[PDB]
Design a protein around this ligand. Structure first.
Ligand code: TDR
Ligand code: TDR
Ligand code: TDR
Ligand code: TDR
Ligand code: TDR
Ligand code: TDR
Ligand code: NA
Ligand code: NA
Ligand code: NA
Lengths: 247, 251, 251, 251, 251, 251
């Protein structure tokens, strides 16, 4: 059977049960090449899929595109093909003054400022990572020598108003999000990104293990708009986290 | 002055104030070549951007990726660079027995089963197209010979549970969406897709003109499988139609 | 058959499948008399009902009263008696500085600041008109020589706090509506009225065709008390327009 | 001092601080003639207004029309003209088997199945009557010889789906209201009507005293078509009761 | 046979069908000793349970602890053992300048700023007392010589941010509650407490009779400190009043 | 110098403690404190019994919370005012997964917010999640004790009965929101029900406090609704050993 969007079969994955899921299709080959025997499988829309071998075990690398909706398709279709563990890596904007560019964040829970999470569980349900995955990501990030923060991430369906950016075409933010950055800062939230609420909610409510690690490329107390080094370190960390998840 | 995700500048757009926004980056060149002097501008992530000329006026073609969040970035960044009118095209399924594969749908309003629309306006606000764009799309669609339906589209943040698909890894659909397909069918909803609620709400609440036209490629109520010829013709017709709708908007 | 509130039977309607539905019972006779052979049918509560003939076809004119609840009863009972198309005409207060007193507005979608719409479809569903009715109303309004705006209307269950009026007994507006007029202005909303969200949602989710056209009698950025001759001229033009829109809907 | 809809001035009310507010404009004169020196003041739209005198004190009688939105206008405008106490009288459909046709109900709180109440207070706020008014209504109802029930009323923005009626044009009830009549029955709710949630919430949050008393004209567990003599008797007793409750409030 | 939290059996209650339910376990014995033959039954967690006799009839006194969740367990388990009427007593802080320390408040409805009420009825349902209990409490309170206020109480799941207290560890109040005290004050709300929304909603939707009476021991709007004597007298009066209200409820 | 409002202790009383163990039942406080050095009773008021003790030379406080988020929120706030920054919750729980056995322990990784008090600290979108260090310490302490330990999501309810979908109750009814909810949570992989974690974790995670929850399983809800009240002996003893060892790891 060949899934609707990803263009791969179960056989193509060579028994892989773990996927690393970056957002940018261009990052997929970079991650795969950190491992052994990388093989290009397919590319369609925002979904580029490779497989590789890590300590002799097959691993998939598959891009998600931006946002919960496109991520939800990739996760569902990979799960149909046997994948059970999902490691998200990406970039992020920090909102706490003490978090610096180049630091890494492992999400312990996400503020659900998305829509797709609600397609898996009502809002009351926590957007929480698998504890083993979060533990592996913390260990990999700390062992790398990075400065690592564990905490809550605000996960938004937009890059602009939902992250309270004003340098925009309208220069306006809807009532719901006015003052929201300060609110999240006061509540100890570490960072903004756009996929973790969907990923974590869908997996935690569907018997899949997931976690998120991100490299900080901007601090929103400094400016609104932004990283090559941070990105490179982040992907080395996620591969080491995958190594720790292998059985 | 280079936008963060799309990687283009205002000067790159050569004065374009109208964009055609398909979902699939591979479709961008296909639309652009229906116009004059198509030129590739950039490709970053799911965003492939071309410029072209239609009746002597610059037009942008930019893919959106799947879903409201990635669409919202492309529309915002294009608006920063002067684009004011957005014509969405794609292919779609339909959920009504009277809508056939190969037909076209022009959305008159969207059921907001998304999240990004709420980042622009509260749920009470209608996800509705600009009337001139919807009118241009209907006319272009009819002129192509297609059977055209005007009506409501259900716009979902998921392809699977939000469209009440059960053929999935878990086979479960959360309470909110159980029975939802029949509910929308009984309310006259024509089809599902994944971007219109965000696009229409963002634009209608931000001073931008938008509309959506789609070719029907599956019908959730029909067991039969559409033949390859029909599907090929439908994809080609859809992009011919959106370019003709753009021509009507530039007049 | 018979119905619970309107006091008319299917036979009374003489085969009418289209209704013009003003708010004020006193406007019913005025509208009917623009057509041929107007006949008074009944008056009970806020529901005054006439029949007339337009190009030889029976048309019913029925007042709705103020608000979604009373409108929902009239529409349901007219539908039980065979009516399938509903043309709303009324007065409105504009909220945009570029919309002048005496202009006309054809609603392309309503902000659902009502309660009755939720008795037909959840909030995500768009309060949008039938495209043919909206097209007919735009055409009739423009052909009359009026200045016509197509756009979003805020449809409120109250005249006072839900339209952010402070010159009231308490001078208070609940948190939900504080700052709301500025919010709708910034989102491009044209006007306030009190029935369109209910009417459009009910009809769009029930297989009925509906639209709304309105004459601007005040602008909220200006004064609250209309000038009498100006108001009379606007009201007269609005009912001429809605009758011409009905003519365009006849088959 | 004038108001926008009711067409009366403060002077017209002759110092009245209490209003009786039936729904049907035709009931206004019937209530007024139970008092001294009734005088017609105005009729505009669904608002018919009379003044009268009760034990030497001026009282106003003003119809509300159907639903919270039209009720909210009348209450606000009467409050602008000095009215501080509002006694609602109206018909109702009981939903409990132990409540008989011809009984009376005094509402102790309303289920807010409306929209206009939210324009005065968020949903958490209780739609509850002034305790003095409820007490006066219970006493007046009992003194008339009626069987009187105190309890919760479900107050709906629709007559049809929000009261879970299926004998309608579509025969559908939106998900929110499917099974709702059984749910309210099991929660001890007595009856349905369409104005109390708005009236009680707006008054309780605005420093106005309000209450509602109603005669039971049908029981939803029985039949929808009332017997004429029984209904006539119930309606006559209801208005005698509300006038006696007004007398008690003016003591 | 023995309820899980309260640790009592039906036989332990000696036929009681009425309970007085203070919050503080230390108050249970004090209330019981105002009646005849007080007998300690059990103490587990925040639940101290006594029985006593009032005019020859068995009455239960049972503490609830703080908050709706704790209260909901006590009410449920007592209802399993035959209790049908629940009289809540305590002391409270007022938010209206006209309410004085030493006055009594009888709740006519509660603002549902809790969570447990939603486990019995959706938010639309009114948190309202049984009319007989509220009537008995008003009579007992007035007969004591106290100044009594009938009105709305705001019932919060927190003591601190939900009552808009800023003198806290973080000094933060979440958006929902910023400005809320002034909002409730302007809407005429008398006081804050933490159990009535749950109690009243649970009982009103479950066929149980409930009400709440409280003595005012502090006023958020007055800067002075009440003296020890006045506070002592108010605490003593509140429990004498609830026992007299129980007397009025006995059949 | 101040004495907090409910707990009746001062900062000086805590001897520099920055960590609290917070069981629900006041009777459990001494039992936990005696596992440490130099336990001393500080205060008891309402459901709040407070001891201090020393663990590896560091002062620790043990404070009961009572049942539910509202009473828990008071204790946490007042302890934080006195310098406490880390909170370790221990309690009992009902498992809802068939593979979880009586006597197992559960460390909560996130809570389903079926409470009300959490909303007084953060909107519903915010995750009710523990501090990662506390959860890590609790898992290690639990494993080291020889217990079978589960990490996962906990449903945290404002009621013991309908919010945990118990039907062996006075009404035998569960409100629509909670009908079928146990099966839904089971299908979503939720491990267990309790009543305080959503409030505790949300309050702390949004207020700069570290918190976690560990619970001993005393019933499996796939088997029956009510625990025997005897299996709560060995399970309780091991649970408090575990929470003290988790505290040791945090210091
Ligand atoms: C840098 C960055 C990446 N992704 C986001 O969602 N927000 C940001 O600020
Ligand atoms: C065919 C199809 C395309 N896009 C969707 O979102 N749903 C569908 O069913
Ligand atoms: C003039 C006017 C009419 N109808 C409304 O609802 N609002 C207004 O301002
Ligand atoms: C009889 C009746 C009157 N009013 C209503 O709202 N419902 C009813 O059933
Ligand atoms: C005095 C007082 C008591 N109980 C509350 O809940 N709030 C208050 O202010
Ligand atoms: C045993 C048990 C304890 N606490 C709860 O909240 N639920 C349960 O089932
Ligand atoms: Na995407
Ligand atoms: Na009306
Ligand atoms: Na408690």
């Amino acid at each position: 059977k060949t899934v609707f969007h990803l263009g791969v079969t179960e056989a193509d994955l060579n028994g892989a049960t773990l996927a690393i899921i970056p957002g940018d299709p261009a990052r997929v080959q970079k991650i795969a090449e950190l491992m052994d025997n990388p093989v290009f499988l397919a590319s369609h829309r925002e979904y580029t899929v490779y497989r590789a071998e890590l300590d002799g075990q097959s691993v998939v690398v598959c891009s998600t595109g931006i946002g919960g909706p496109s991520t939800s398709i990739a996760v569902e279709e990979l799960a149909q093909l046997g994948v059970r563990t999902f490691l998200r890596v990406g970039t992020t904007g920090a909102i706490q003054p003490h978090v610096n560019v180049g630091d890494m964040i492992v999400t312990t829970g996400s503020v659900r400022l998305d829509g797709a999470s609600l397609h898996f569980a009502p809002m009351e349900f926590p957007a929480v990572p698998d504890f083993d995955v979060a533990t592996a990501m913390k260990a990999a990030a700390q062992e790398s020598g990075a400065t690592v923060h564990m905490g809550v991430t605000a996960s938004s369906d937009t890059f602009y108003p939902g992250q309270e950016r004003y340098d925009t075409f309208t220069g306006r933010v809807v009532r719901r999000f006015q003052g929201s950055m300060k609110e999240w800062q006061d509540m100890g939230v570490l960072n903004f990104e756009m996929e973790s609420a969907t990923l974590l909610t869908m997996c935690a409510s569907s018997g899949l293990k997931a976690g998120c690690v991100a490299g900080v490329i901007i601090n929103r107390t400094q400016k609104e708009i932004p990283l090559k080094e941070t990105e490179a370190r982040s992907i080395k960390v996620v591969v080491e986290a995958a190594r720790k998840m292998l059985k």
